[PDB]
Amino acid sequence: VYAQEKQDFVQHFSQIVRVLTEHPEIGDAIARLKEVLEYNAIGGKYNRGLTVVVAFRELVEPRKQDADSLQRAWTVGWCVELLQAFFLVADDIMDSSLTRRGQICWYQKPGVGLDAINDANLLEACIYRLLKLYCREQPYYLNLIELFLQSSYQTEIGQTLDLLTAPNVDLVRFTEKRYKSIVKYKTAFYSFYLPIAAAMYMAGIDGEKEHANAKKILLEMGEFFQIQDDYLDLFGDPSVTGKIGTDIQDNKCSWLVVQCLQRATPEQYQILKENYGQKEAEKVARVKALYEELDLPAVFLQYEEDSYSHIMALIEQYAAPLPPAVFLGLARKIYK
Amino acid sequence: VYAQEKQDFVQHFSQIVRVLTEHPEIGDAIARLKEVLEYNAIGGKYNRGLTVVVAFRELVEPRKQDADSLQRAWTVGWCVELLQAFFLVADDIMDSSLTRRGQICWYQKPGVGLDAINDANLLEACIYRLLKLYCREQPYYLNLIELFLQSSYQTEIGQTLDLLTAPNVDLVRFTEKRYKSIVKYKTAFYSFYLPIAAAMYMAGIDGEKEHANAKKILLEMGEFFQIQDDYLDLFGDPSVTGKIGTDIQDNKCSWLVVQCLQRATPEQYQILKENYGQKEAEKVARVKALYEELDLPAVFLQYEEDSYSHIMALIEQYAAPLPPAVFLGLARKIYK
Ligand SMILES: Cc1ccc(-c2cc3c(N[C@@H](Cc4cccc(F)c4)P(=O)(O)O)ncnc3s2)cc1Cl
Numbered sequence: 001v002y003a004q005e006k007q008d009f010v011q012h013f014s015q016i017v018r019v020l021t022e023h024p025e026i027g028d029a030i031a032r033l034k035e036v037l038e039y040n041a042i043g044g045k046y047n048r049g050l051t052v053v054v055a056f057r058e059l060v061e062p063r064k065q066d067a068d069s070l071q072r073a074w075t076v077g078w079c080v081e082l083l084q085a086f087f088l089v090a091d092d093i094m095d096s097s098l099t100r101r102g103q104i105c106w107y108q109k110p111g112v113g114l115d116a117i118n119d120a121n122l123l124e125a126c127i128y129r130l131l132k133l134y135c136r137e138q139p140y141y142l143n144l145i146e147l148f149l150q151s152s153y154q155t156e157i158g159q160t161l162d163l164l165t166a167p168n169v170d171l172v173r174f175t176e177k178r179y180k181s182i183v184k185y186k187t188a189f190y191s192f193y194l195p196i197a198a199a200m201y202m203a204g205i206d207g208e209k210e211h212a213n214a215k216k217i218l219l220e221m222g223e224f225f226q227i228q229d230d231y232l233d234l235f236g237d238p239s240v241t242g243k244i245g246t247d248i249q250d251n252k253c254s255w256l257v258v259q260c261l262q263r264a265t266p267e268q269y270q271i272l273k274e275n276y277g278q279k280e281a282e283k284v285a286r287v288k289a290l291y292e293e294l295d296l297p298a299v300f301l302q303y304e305e306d307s308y309s310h311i312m313a314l315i316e317q318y319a320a321p322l323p324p325a326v327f328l329g330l331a332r333k334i335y336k
Numbered sequence: 337v338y339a340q341e342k343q344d345f346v347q348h349f350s351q352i353v354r355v356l357t358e359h360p361e362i363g364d365a366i367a368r369l370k371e372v373l374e375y376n377a378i379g380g381k382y383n384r385g386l387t388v389v390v391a392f393r394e395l396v397e398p399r400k401q402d403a404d405s406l407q408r409a410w411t412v413g414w415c416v417e418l419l420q421a422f423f424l425v426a427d428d429i430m431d432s433s434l435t436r437r438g439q440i441c442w443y444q445k446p447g448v449g450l451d452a453i454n455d456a457n458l459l460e461a462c463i464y465r466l467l468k469l470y471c472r473e474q475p476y477y478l479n480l481i482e483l484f485l486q487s488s489y490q491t492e493i494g495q496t497l498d499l500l501t502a503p504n505v506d507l508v509r510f511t512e513k514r515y516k517s518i519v520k521y522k523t524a525f526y527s528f529y530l531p532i533a534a535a536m537y538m539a540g541i542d543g544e545k546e547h548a549n550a551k552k553i554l555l556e557m558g559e560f561f562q563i564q565d566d567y568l569d570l571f572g573d574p575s576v577t578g579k580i581g582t583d584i585q586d587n588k589c590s591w592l593v594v595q596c597l598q599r600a601t602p603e604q605y606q607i608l609k610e611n612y613g614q615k616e617a618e619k620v621a622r623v624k625a626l627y628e629e630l631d632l633p634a635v636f637l638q639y640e641e642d643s644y645s646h647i648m649a650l651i652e653q654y655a656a657p658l659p660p661a662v663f664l665g666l667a668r669k670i671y672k
Pocket residue numbers: 045047048051191192195224225226228229232330333334335336
């Protein structure tokens with residue numbers, strides 16, 4: 001689906017850039033914007049953008065899929081990638097990250113620094129420029145502008161909650177209710193709801209009820225994805241994933257610590273109070289081994305089965321009238 | 337006009353905040369957003385927001401001005417103030433500023449720091465939340481969403497140009513063409529075009545030609561405003577303005593340095609190369625006195641008269657069919 005549509009998606013990028021990087025004296029700014037687009041919108045897996053394109057094909061009767069409709073699908077997928085890029089560039093400055101996608105974070109490059117704040121705003125702005133240029137005449141134009149704006153806001157407000165929740169190792173902040181709330185707003189809305197919802201609108205499916213039904217399935221898939229992402233940060237083999245995890249060094253509200261704290265005798269709370277959020281490795285070793293000693297690998301395994309049963313019921317209940325394959329194709333990318 | 341409508345404008349702010357700061361577990365984020373709104377959207381002169389409200393009154397036949405139309409005018413004015421706030425919070429982090437509006441910049445507050453990057457994005461997002469909540473049923477809704485998005489982009493792309501132009505004292509970058517380009521994109525579009533254009537749309541005046549005509553007048557007024565702003569940074573009495581200027585310490589592309597560089601013998605270029613962008617005061621004294629020694633106070637005075645003659649011709653030529661008072665009220669705020 002994705003294996004076999006990733007090709008035209010990445011080749012489209014070059015057109016995306018052409019049309020955004022066309023008024024003599026603004027030239028130098030426009031060159032900078034090109035360098036920003038190139039460094040930051042390229043080099044991920046493109047799962048979110050591609051989901052737009054795949055879902056567009058599944059949703060539109062194939063006799064309403066001319067060259068220009070496809071091109072709008074490619075474009076809106078690239079909009080989702082640009083929203084991703086905006087959030088990351090800015091999040092990397094906020095967290096003080098060193099690398100991203102296997103390279104030096106844009107803000108850490110020589111003579112970029114905090115100028116990356118403007119660069120990131122430009123990435124966001126490019127979303128609406130593309131939507132104007134390619135979709136202004138379409139009946140779903142407004143629908144999409146609102147979708148992207150709301151996705152930004154949800155993701156922003158989730159970032160606030162995350163930042164309040166994890167500055168300083170106060171583990172009383174790290175609750176289940178709070179973990180779930182952070183994942184929904186910061187991650188799931190834009191990563192899972194947004195791309196399918198966009199394809200929906202592009203197909204004419206604008207009903208509030210249809211969107212709510214898809215949302216219900218897709219926010220739940222997003223919660224599982226992040227939960228598996230947190231497991232793997234620590235237990236994932238690093239040559240299968242790519243990441244090597246610093247969740248624990250960074251005092252993250254990770255599903256692991258949440259579960260751990262649900263399960264600990266008061267003596268264990270202490271070992272964790274003493275090791276959570278530390279630089280030193282031995283004190284990260286002894287967090288791992290405390291998680292191992294509470295069979296969190298196994299709780300996760302149980303959680304993962306339960307979750308899969310749940311998603312399948314959701315799809316059975318709430319997919320109609322969309323093709324269950326829209327959702328199943330996504331479920332297969334994450335439950336693998 | 338403004339003297340006599342500032343009152344209901346600032347009192348509206350409290351309602352703006354109520355409706356943005358209403359889903360249990362997101363509460364703590366919402367409290368933070370309230371603190372962000374309160375610190376950053378309050379304490380300026382409100383010229384831009386108020387311009388919305390004043391121009392709305394002049395433009396709408398007074399028999400289409402019910403309680404709810406007025407409330408939408410107050411709201412859209414507050415949107416312009418929020419856009420202002422978004423840019424400033426972010427610009428203060430980028431420039432490493434210490435104070436703003438007579439207080440500690442938000443990002444310099446204890447335990448805010450770079451979290452202010454998200455805070456600023458939230459301010460931007462609030463613009464579209466308000467536009468949804470108060471204007472979604474209006475026929476000019478889309479018009480306004482596009483206006484605000486384009487204003488953001490223009491201002492962002494201007495900020496890029498400014499940052500490229502002034503990192504390092506390379507005065508070869510500081511040209512007239514480049515000064516004007518920076519002012520138009522970074523300042524004039526949002527400060528002058530945006531608020532009148534918004535009032536226009538709210539009144540039903542959506543024509544491209546009417547907008548182009550108003551734009552022509554208003555971008556020119558914005559160029560004068562900033563030019564006078566740069567003069568005053570240095571020659572303004574600091575107890576009449578409020579600001580005391582660091583334009584020269586900061587290596588700014590100020591209209592002053594532009595003119596100076598147009599006027600200097602090669603020996604003078606050197607005195608300036610040696611004093612521009614310095615901390616030390618004596619080396620800022622001797623920039624002032626070099627500007628004084630080239631009668632820049634007087635070139636400015638000439639420039640200011642020329643400019644006023646020009647704006648009046650523009651208004652004569654391009655105001656119709658809007659009431660010339662829309663423009664004159666603004667001209668009186670800046671040529672005073
Ligand atoms: C809609 C959507 C949004 C994001 C993704 C992502 C999957 C993914 C990812 N998936 C791996 C497995 C995986 C990693 C982390 C969480 C998870 F649920 C699944 P893979 O496909 O590389 O085996 N790895 C690293 N980053 C990402 S981002 C996938 C989808 Cl289908």
